[PDB]
Paper text:
At the heart of DNA processing of all [name]-endonucleases is a structurally defined catalytic nickase domain that first recognizes a specific sequence/structure of DNA; nicks [name] at a ‘nic site’ to yield a sequestered 5′ end that remains covalently bound to the [name] endonuclease and a free 3′OH that can be used as a primer for DNA replication; and finally, facilitates a strand transfer reaction to resolve the covalent intermediate. To uncover the [name] recognition mechanism of Reps and identify potential motifs that might confer sequence specificity, we solved the first high resolution crystal structures of two [name] nickase domains from Porcine circovirus 2 (PCV2) and [name] (WDV) with 12% sequence identity, bound to [name] encoding minimal sequences comprising the respective origin of replication (ori) sequences.
We present structures of two 10-mer bound structures of inactive PCV2Y96F (1.93 Å resolution) and WDVY106F (1.80 Å resolution), and one 8-mer bound WDVY106F (2.61 Å resolution) structure.
Numbering used by the authors: 8 to 53, 57 to 111, 113 to 127
The structure:
DNA sequence: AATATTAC
């Protein structure tokens, strides 16, 4: 039985290559009930993988482990599944994934929130 | 969970 109940989410999509911008744009509508405040999306192309950090205005309660899955819009139309965690420190997470980044592979939206 | 071994 899986439950993530948090305002702040650290997503990881292994073996995933989605352009960070489209991952950001569609995760923003998937999460729109929780009013996303800030989103950062970083593709790492050295095990190719996505990291996403999401700061919402309301505590998101996620109980469907597939609710955030993403599908390519071209062949082979693969489902991409994330590790979904509550972020223990948004500053540490942000630091981790932006350090992992070229600035071509990054996508931000909104104003970063200074958690307390 | 459920990608996968990536994930503060
Ligand atoms: Mn990484
Ligand atoms: Mn870890």
């Amino acid at each position: 039985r899986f439950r993530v109940y948090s305002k702040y989410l650290f997503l990881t999509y292994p073996q995933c290559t989605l352009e960070p911008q489209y991952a950001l744009d569609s995760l923003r509508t998937l999460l729109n009930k929780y009013e996303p405040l800030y989103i950062a999306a970083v593709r790492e192309l050295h095990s190719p993988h996505l990291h996403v950090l999401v700061q919402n205005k309301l505590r998101a309660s996620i109980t469907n482990p597939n609710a955030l899955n993403l599908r390519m819009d071209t062949s082979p139309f693969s489902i991409f599944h994330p590790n979904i965690q509550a972020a223990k420190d948004c500053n540490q997470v942000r630091d981790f994934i932006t350090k992992e980044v070229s600035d071509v592979n990054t996508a931000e939206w909104g104003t970063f929130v200074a958690v307390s």
